[PDB]
Design a protein. Structure first.
Lengths: 513, 513
């Protein structure tokens, strides 16, 4: 209460109790005033694959979505080595210690004061009535490292566009315009605070295990099958062979490898690659409304060893990389690659097609031939693994409401949700400057320049699956690198900059297929 | 309470429950100090049609009167397509988050500070003891779009004037002077807030329906009437004809079309019109106290198709039109016309007179003649429609207290009320500058320059009439335009300016006459 007493305390920790783990995190945020308190439509130019119609909004939004917001690199190691699965359960959100500050510029110098009576106004959208921009893997999340202070991103959305003469950017009768002040928000001065709770609906555990067997390798090698097939037509008579005696390709099997499609493969060594000034021409693409879009990422189809793909798998970067690009003779040291090769026991590899198939009918005078299938799709009796969740990856996504969807899991990995966590939106309440004495009906153009800052917290209850495995011998686990390095891993440098040295997937411990 | 905690929250929404609809709206307002805390009389000059005597007041007033303050264009569409009527019931008013700021000018620069101990003082006039300036369709209302910030208008009134020698502006012994500080107002610092409630007296629903039949067309076409009339005098004998056999003009009818008068009609095409540098000479006028006044708007008499009248019907403008005038070869794109043509089934059209009448007595040697009636008035057994309410139009008006009034509905459309919603008046309490040390009995000339701002809310409970109609075929309804446009309708542009593209009346669904 009041100006003098604080509205909250700092909670950042992790609590491991039985099969539950409970993470708490707090950060300090800074909110500017976007668009001078205005809504503005934004649109592209001309015809092309990138054309858009939308609205930029004088609001800002908290995004905690990404994993390592909630986990320290030790808690992640501790999590992925000991357990076969994780899913979220509950979350708890709070804002406190709001303080609003005003800026004044005399000549060329700034003087920042503190306005005690100014407010900010915040609301969460529980019914998902606004366009949902989370789960799209944007920037502007809580930083990895608790001592960083970050600036909240601006909120905006974009909507249907339409075919004008030379312009596909022309709005359509159904383009929606949402005013966020038509929501019943909550106005907060410096003393009072904001809170709400949320509960996840049941989802399946994410599998933290790598398989112990290939599909084609599921059998007893010591005894042959009782099934018979036609091996040899020669000699004007049919010859049936019995499946067995250590010839694996011939066995009958109940299950078949998962779906996928080929993807162009680019060697990590730079000298062997073909010198293309862009990879857009060679990418896998899908098209919607007459315009083509890169297909990324595909199904978790691993490439060949020593190769990679164009946006086929996720990739990250350090804090050392600023700007839009980096380059090196091999994959740059700032780039953090991910690899799905743990899934090659079930999922299809990207370096060649799915299989062959019968090309033609035969007779005595024509030879049988076969043709190769480059792509595959879902068939009955077929199994696959979903893409892995990383420490730097997104936690969830919103399943779009549609008349149908198949295996609704995000292609970037995550937990697909019908009712995801509500977006949280915040704004600085506009304070006008001194009005004129004579009345004028026009809008107020000029306001008092001000910004706000405070602290937030996120507390998520995670459910996790125990690991019971009777394998004798030891398993691969995540360990720190063994070299003496100038900078300790997952730690600041001399200049004070926090650095993630590499991505960490959750699949180490094995499991029988 | 206190400086640190907020006095309210943001409520803007709409709730449709059964036959009630409940709208909430909030805006941010800015109040200057008018007239340097002084009352001033204001008066015209010389003799003429515009002459006045009145007082300008150091007060300001909230006006929510106009419709679209309370309804979004989707809520309006949703309202007018589904329902046959609407009337208000209750309203609830609040002010909160008051904050007062002081201005200081050193050399040529302004520095705005925040005075925590300053007050504003507000009251509502429940007994209607002040002159009532609402319902006169002035500016200074809540903006349509919730993100706009507006400045409160100044309060003032004007009173009886009198015939001086060359001056009709001379005050009269009965000219009233009202001091608004002689009211028991309420003084509010930044922490405390203001509220009151109000309840409308029973009024008839506004009819949202267009008629399904003309008056003259009410009958069964398949059977003739049993009534007889004199068709033909020729042949030295009287000939009675029986009304029927599909001759409609001859039928007897119980009801007759509504009152009105002719009005000069101006084609929308500019080339066909007569080049008058003003329309005042040609307007319909009524005169009071020897001075002439335009008669606007008249009774809802529709003009011809493709024609309009001089202030015969309401007209609005965009936010794009600033200044006192706009011009184009046809009706400008900023001007928003309204049309009463939905009422032509009952009400009289403006393009010609009401009917004919017998000119003279006859004999064998003189022919019967008739003369044309340009104007009409109220007669027994006559029916009419009242002017429609638009989205941009005024909601109510105060029926002036008089010994008689007929069909008291506002000629601009609305709900005439004996006891309308109370005016709300607000002022910055004057704070004097440093007084001299030696006593002086004169008034304090110099004050501390300051202004105030805050938020308001208006919550109105609307009652509405269900629609039960058994007509087979579909009906006209309000729909968005079908063209792809550069800017979506009822939405901001690139520059951030909200635009109403056209007026919307409430009459779409039909009803039997």
């Amino acid at each position: 209460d009041g100006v003098g007493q604080s509205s909250g305390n700092w909670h950042c920790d992790s609590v491991w109790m039985g099969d539950r783990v409970l993470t708490k995190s707090t950060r300090t945020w800074s909110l500017p005033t976007y668009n001078n308190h205005l809504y503005k439509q934004i649109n592209g130019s001309g015809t092309g694959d990138a054309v858009y119609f939308g609205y930029s909004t004088p609001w800002g939004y908290f995004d905690f979505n990404r994993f390592h917001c909630h986990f320290s690199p030790r808690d992640w190691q501790r999590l992925v080595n000991n357990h076969w699965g994780i899913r979220p359960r509950r979350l708890n959100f709070k804002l406190f210690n709001i303080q609003v500050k005003e800026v004044t510029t005399t000549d060329g110098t700034k003087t920042i004061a503190n306005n005690l009576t100014s407010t900010v106004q915040v609301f969460a959208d529980t019914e998902h009535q606004l366009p949902y921009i989370l789960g799209s893997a944007h920037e502007g999340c809580m930083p990895p490292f608790p001592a960083d202070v970050f600036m909240l991103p601006q909120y905006g959305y974009l909507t249907l566009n339409g075919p004008g003469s030379n312009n596909n950017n022309l709005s359509t009768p159904s383009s929606a315009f949402y005013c966020l002040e038509y929501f019943p928000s909550q106005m907060l001065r410096t003393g009072n605070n904001f809170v709400f709770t949320y509960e996840f609906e049941k989802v399946p555990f994410h599998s933290m295990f790598m398989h112990n067997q290939a599909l084609d390798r599921l059998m007893n090698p010591l005894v042959d099958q009782y099934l018979w097939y036609l091996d040899a037509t020669s000699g004007n008579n049919l010859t049936f062979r019995k499946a067995g005696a250590k010839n694996f390709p011939e066995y009958f099997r109940n299950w078949i490898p998962g779906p996928g499609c080929r993807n162009q493969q680019w060697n990590k060594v730079g000298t062997k690659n073909n010198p293309q000034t862009g990879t857009w021409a060679s990418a896998n693409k899908w098209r919607l409304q007459g315009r083509l879009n890169k297909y990324a990422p595909g199904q978790p189809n691993a490439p060949a060893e020593g190769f990679l793909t164009n946006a086929g798998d996720l990739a990250f970067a350090n804090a050392k990389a600023t700007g839009a690009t980096t380059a090196a003779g091999t994959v740059p040291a700032d780039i953090l690659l991910t690899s799905e090769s743990e899934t090659t026991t079930t999922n299809m590899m990207s370096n060649n097609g799915w299989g062959a198939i019968a090309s033609n009918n035969q007779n005595a005078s024509v030879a049988p031939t076969v043709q190769y299938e480059d792509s595959a799709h879902v068939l009955p009796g077929m199994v696959w693994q979903d893409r892995d969740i990383y420490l730097q990856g997104p936690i969830w996504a919103k399943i779009p409401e549609t008349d149908g969807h198949f295996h609704p899991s995000p292609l970037m990995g995550g937990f697909g949700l019908k009712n995801p966590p509500p977006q949280i939106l915040i704004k600085n309440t506009p304070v006008p400057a001194d009005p004129p004495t004579q009345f004028s009906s026009q809008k107020i153009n000029s306001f008092i320049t001000q910004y706000s800052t405070g602290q937030m917290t996120v507390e998520i209850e995670w459910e996790l699956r125990k690991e019971n495995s009777k394998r004798w011998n030891p398993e691969i686990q995540y360990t720190a690198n063994f070299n003496n390095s100038a900078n300790a891993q997952f730690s600041v440098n001399n200049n004070g900059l926090y650095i993630e040295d590499r991505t960490i997937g959750t699949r180490y411990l094995t499991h029988t297929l």
